[PDB]
Symmetry: C3
Subunit: 329 residues, 3 copies
């Protein structure tokens, strides 16, 4: 029968076209792939002014707000802070949230099991005017975090500029690239603020723009803290020119339940010696955490994967040809 | 023919079971799989009181023993420390381990090639009544690490608590999750310590329990340092409800031969100005290093992988669909 | 015909030999593969003496130039620094680069949209003799960072020592390995210098030697910054003894165009209290950044991968029982 024969021939031609389009045009099986080694450097430029009641104006700069301060891919920018200054090692009342004693005999000398603020003397000196707390030996005065300022102190972090220098290298092809590849110049770097469509290759990002692209409001994320992840993807084709190699920036917002453990916060202390006494300033900072992850793949033409895909080709052609079985008749 | 015909049908049935089974039910083919982007924040709650001769009681808090102090996957908690206070830049005798000279002519001006402690002034100054060491320009009180306290100074480290907040997101499927599962609540967090079976979902870990689960003794580790790696695995099937996606915490102990370089140690310094002179306190800390690694995969139903698996099963059937006929 | 039959048998034998040699031996199909969990700790030994005009000699030790300072895998070693001491929050003329005002009227009270240096007071105060800049409220001495020193201040980093301790663990195989191997001992550790041919297992690396192996000049990198990545690869077969497991150290240099943002630089401040006043020393450091990335795989003999590879075998065998049979058409 001629009809079944021409149908079999059409099926064979369809399989041929599908394989030719898939193994080469679509999947690029003729190319071999390699993974990059990448290093990310971060530079924050911006100035913040905080004027707390009872304290003079305080200035925060690149060395102050960025916590790693050595170019780490994962970093934190200060958005709000609670400060306890002039902490000395002495005996003072503990934070009421830890424990409260109605009488001195109620408390017992020792250390708390889960949340310990110090060694309890057990004499119960008053913290509040009405209620008393256990006297501990620890840095005094104890930090209070019950009151969180609704307006963010470093509320201008929306307009701080972040410069990301990402240097990637493929050792299999021995090709080194950078996010400023062949388009950004000495004048372009000055006036480009990253937009999704307007200026994608520019490495100067606005923190507020990044937070808004991540899908989170900057005010609530700055008040209590947050996490924003920046991913730089490198899709490089060695067959084409190196100018075509361009990074893609993706911004995601990592959030959880607001009721339980809202935001990102951490406590750090600055130690000093004043008047012959060693003291410290303790800052509890709620800041947006920026984690930068770079992943990329480069493909270059090679003869061995080409021959492998061609053989896979001959193979799939075998499947189709074997089917006829002498025209099943 | 039936003697081997039923065997041929049985072989075909086995092929079909393999297709719709190990390739379809297990080793999910009816789902597309995506990796996550994860960020971890570590918070240490604990306080240590250390009595040191010549320095008095010292209080170590969250900001103190956490050297990163900001929150990172790799962080070290102080377990023991050797303190050299009031280091000032002036000519002084070097450490006896560096070099020993009976006379001043033995030492030569310059800098040591191996383990340089300072610039030699070409003179030898007695370190003590016993031995003399070459005079070098640097921090005047040289740190002596020969004596390590057998009882850990921060031995209360076992009970320091660690809260690990891990936020993951699968972008292809747009699902965001956190280690604080819906089963976990404020009242639970007020009184929970993680246990593998008793409290699997708890986000609060005891450092001593973590070190014990890693396979290392806490005392010997805190004496000289150690490495414990905490891996958080997220195996979530998005075909079910989102409540059924949870984290698995696994603890590993990264240790080596104690004869050569036992434990983990480092030196960090605190600089200050006293009496108009710049000084510093140098701490050589042996602390446990905790590394947080998060890897996970999420699978969601999709038409294209299902059709690809069905097509592969056809051809897996193809092999057997052959006939005993010339 | 005997010729077609012997050709068919020869092709079958060739396919069998290929299956035996490539699937089983080349890629080790009979061995299941597992990844590792790795931790890297870095320790720097070296001292630098930097003498600045008008200031006392400065000594830099391991605690000084190692910025993370907790043995972090990604770390930066100080190679050059520009220091502004005794900065106290006060009204000062802004850095000329940010702005140049001819008169007070030109200055506008407020902030700068890009690269803000302080809060403008609306006053044009003389930064120096010839030109004036708008007054700001910020640290008192603005960092004039124009003159990066040509000779590297911490040039003694050309001879520095770095000890990298890498501990890996395969949990599927429950095997723990370390960069320190049976070949390395304390007597060896004392005087060992890494040399990719002479001492491959040496754990003590020279920073200058690492930068040279990366493919970058040390002096240029120390002048304005650089990036060198050290990768530790653990590729071993656990069928043999664990002694055969050897790490491989590879060095790469991550560089860019010198015209656009050359090198790596970062600014950090040390805060203190002097005479009852909070002050700070600001340092702009150009230093080589070292990043440690560990990737490894271990293989152990198992019966399930062997059976799967065998099954894949008849798969190729059947293919040939019909391969040349479809070539047999003419
Ligand atoms: N976060 C940022 N925001 C805005 N501009 C930046 C940022 N980081 C760098 N730049 C600009 O890119 C150029 C090259 O960056 P580089 O890393 O060399 O900074 P730099 O020149 O060392 O710093 P400075 O400009 O303060 O001297 C600089 O002229 C600077 O103006
Ligand atoms: N390491 C820990 N051990 C025990 N409980 C913790 C720990 N970290 C956080 N918590 C508890 O989880 C709750 C929410 O966590 P979160 O990180 O928001 O703490 P917080 O609100 O900043 O309070 P705190 O200032 O006491 O850390 C807090 O009430 C706290 O008691
Ligand atoms: N950067 C380095 N260069 C050369 N040798 C080193 C370096 N770091 C450590 N070592 C040597 O390798 C060994 C590592 O052991 P470890 O670092 O635990 O010793 P340690 O007790 O800290 O003594 P040290 O403070 O002298 O290193 C030590 O004997 C030390 O002498
Ligand atoms: N050792 C180390 C250091 C950093 C840092 F120094 F860059 F923060 C990050 C990481 C992380 F695991 F998060 F990638 C590890
Ligand atoms: C009593 O203590 C609480 C904290 O638990 C505090 O909010 C309140 O202001 C105190 N009352 C005073 C100081 O009168
Ligand atoms: C950020 O945008 C402009 C400066 O570019 C300014 O008008 C605006 O007030 C800024 N917003 C904040 C919150 O500082
Ligand atoms: C810098 O590059 C941009 C595009 O990348 C271009 O528009 C601009 O003219 C360039 N600046 C020059 C050539 O001065
Ligand atoms: C807290 O969480 C635990 C975990 O299962 C649960 O059993 C308990 O009922 C919860 N308590 C409240 C008050 O929600
Ligand atoms: C004064 O500062 C300007 C900056 O605009 C600089 O060009 C000039 O050389 C400086 N003059 C002196 C004497 O320092
Ligand atoms: C390193 O040592 C060699 C040999 O002593 C010397 O020539 C070179 O100048 C040194 N490099 C420094 C001190 O930076
Ligand atoms: C030290 O290690 C080296 C290198 O493996 C070796 O040749 C030497 O014999 C070792 N010495 C001792 C005392 O173990
Ligand atoms: Ca001070
Ligand atoms: Ca760090
Ligand atoms: Mg609290
Ligand atoms: Mg020693
Ligand atoms: Mg400048």
């Amino acid at each position: 029968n001629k009809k079944v024969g021409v149908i079999f021939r059409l099926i064979q031609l369809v399989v041929l076209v599908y394989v030719i389009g898939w193994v080469f045009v679509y999947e690029k099986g003729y190319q071999t792939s390699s993974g990059l080694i990448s290093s990310v450097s971060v530079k924050l430029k911006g100035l913040a002014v905080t004027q707390l009641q009872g304290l003079g104006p305080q200035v925060w700069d690149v060395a102050d707000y960025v916590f790693p301060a050595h170019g780490d891919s994962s970093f934190v920018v200060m958005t709000n802070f609670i400060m306890t200054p002039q902490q000395a090692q002495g005996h003072c009342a503990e934070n009421p949230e830890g424990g409260i004693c109605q009488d001195d005999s109620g408390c017992t000398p020792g250390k708390a099991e889960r949340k310990a603020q110090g060694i309890r003397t057990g004499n119960c000196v008053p913290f509040n005017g009405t209620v008393k707390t256990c006297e501990i030996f620890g840095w005094c005065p104890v930090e209070v975090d019950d009151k969180i300022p609704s307006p963010a102190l470093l509320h201008e972090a929306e307009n701080f500029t972040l410069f990301i220098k990402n240097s990637i290298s493929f050792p299999r092809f021995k090709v080194n690239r950078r996010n400023l590849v062949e388009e950004v110049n000495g004048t372009y770097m000055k006036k480009c603020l990253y937009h999704k469509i307007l200026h994608p290759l520019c490495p100067v990002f606005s923190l507020g723009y990044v937070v808004r692209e991540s899908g989170q409001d900057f005010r609530s994320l700055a008040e209590k803290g947050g996490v924003v992840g920046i991913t730089i993807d490198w899709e490089c084709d060695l067959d084409w020119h190196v100018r075509h190699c361009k990074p893609i920036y993706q911004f995601h917002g990592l959030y959880g339940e607001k009721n339980l453990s809202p935001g990102f916060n951490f406590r750090f202390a600055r130690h000093f010696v004043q008047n012959g006494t060693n003291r410290r300033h303790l800052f509890k900072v709620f800041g947006i955490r920026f984690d930068i992850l770079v992943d990329g793949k480069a493909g270059k033409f090679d003869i061995i994967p080409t021959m492998t895909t061609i053989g896979s080709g001959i193979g799939i052609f075998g499947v189709a040809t074997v089917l006829c079985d002498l025209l099943l008749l």
